Symmetry: C2
Subunit: 145 residues, 2 copies
C-alpha cells in the first residue's frame, strides 16, 4: 500500500478514478485536474497497490464560510473514491488522516465536508471517517439579468 500526491504522470490514473467519483466529461475533468495541480490550497492524493491506483482523495483549504463550521479557515474534503474491490480495506481511512495532516500544516483545527441530501452511501462513509453531521441546507441560484 502506497500513497502519492497526484502529478502529470499520475494524470491517467487520477482521471479514471475521478471518472467514477463525479459525473462529467473527460474534457472538463482534465481541465479541472490541471488547475488543481497548480493550486496552493488543493490536495490530490492517489493510493497505490501492486503499482495500481486503487483510491483517490481530493481536498482543499476554505477561507470563505463553510456551513456548519466554527473556525476559519478549515480543511475541506472535496471527494474520496475507492475501487469497489479494494473497499473495506481501510485505505479511505489512510487517505483522510493524511489529508488532516496536510490541513494541520496550515494550522487548521477543523475538517469539513458535504454530501447531497440523498446520498446515504456517502453519509455512511463520512460517519466511518469520523465526521459528524452539522446541518442540512437548500441551495439556490439566479442569473444576473
Amino acid at each position: 500500500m502506497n500513497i502519492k500526491p497526484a502529478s502529470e504522470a499520475s494524470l491517467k490514473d487520477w482521471l479514471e478514478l475521478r471518472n467514477k467519483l463525479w459525473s462529467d466529461s473527460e474534457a472538463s475533468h482534465l481541465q479541472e485536474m490541471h488547475q488543481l495541480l497548480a493550486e496552493k490550497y488543493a490536495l490530490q492524493l492517489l493510493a497505490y497497490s501492486d503499482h495500481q491506483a486503487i483510491a483517490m482523495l481530493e481536498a482543499s483549504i476554505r477561507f470563505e464560510y463553510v456551513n456548519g463550521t466554527e473556525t476559519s479557515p478549515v480543511g475541506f474534503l472535496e471527494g474520496i473514491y475507492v475501487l469497489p474491490a479494494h473497499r473495506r480495506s481501510g485505505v479511505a481511512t489512510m487517505l483522510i488522516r493524511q489529508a488532516e495532516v496536510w490541513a494541520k500544516q496550515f494550522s487548521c483545527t477543523e475538517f469539513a465536508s458535504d454530501a447531497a441530501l440523498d446520498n446515504v452511501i456517502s453519509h455512511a462513509m463520512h460517519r466511518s471517517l469520523g465526521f459528524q453531521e452539522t446541518e442540512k441546507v437548500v441551495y439556490f441560484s439566479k442569473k444576473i439579468d
Copy 2:
C-alpha cells in the same frame, strides 16, 4: 423608497434588523459589522421609508466553490430581512436588484444563496425573488486532532 449602504452612522438601525436574522449578542454583532464595512467583497444595504429602517441585505463575493453554481466568482446572499409590515413593498426585490448590480463589478453572472432545509418560508421567499433551487446538501465537520 431610499436604499442606502450601511455605515458607522447607521449601526444601530443595522443592528436592530440583523439580530432578528441571526440571534446573537450586541457586542459580537457590532464586531462582525465593523469588519464587513472594511471588507471590499462584502455588501451591506439598508432600506428606508418614513425615516425608519424597514429592511436590510448582506451579501458577499465567493471565489471558492458554491454548491449549485456553474461560474466563479459568484455573488452570494448572506441574509435578507424585511419588516413584516413591509413585505409587500417590493423592497426585497429592489434590494436583490442593487446587490446584483454590485456583484457585476466583480464579473459575477450568478447570484447564489442558501437556506436551512426546514425553513420552508425562506424557500418561498427565495423563489419569489427569482431564485431557483439547485441542490439539497448535508454538511459534516470533524475536529483535527
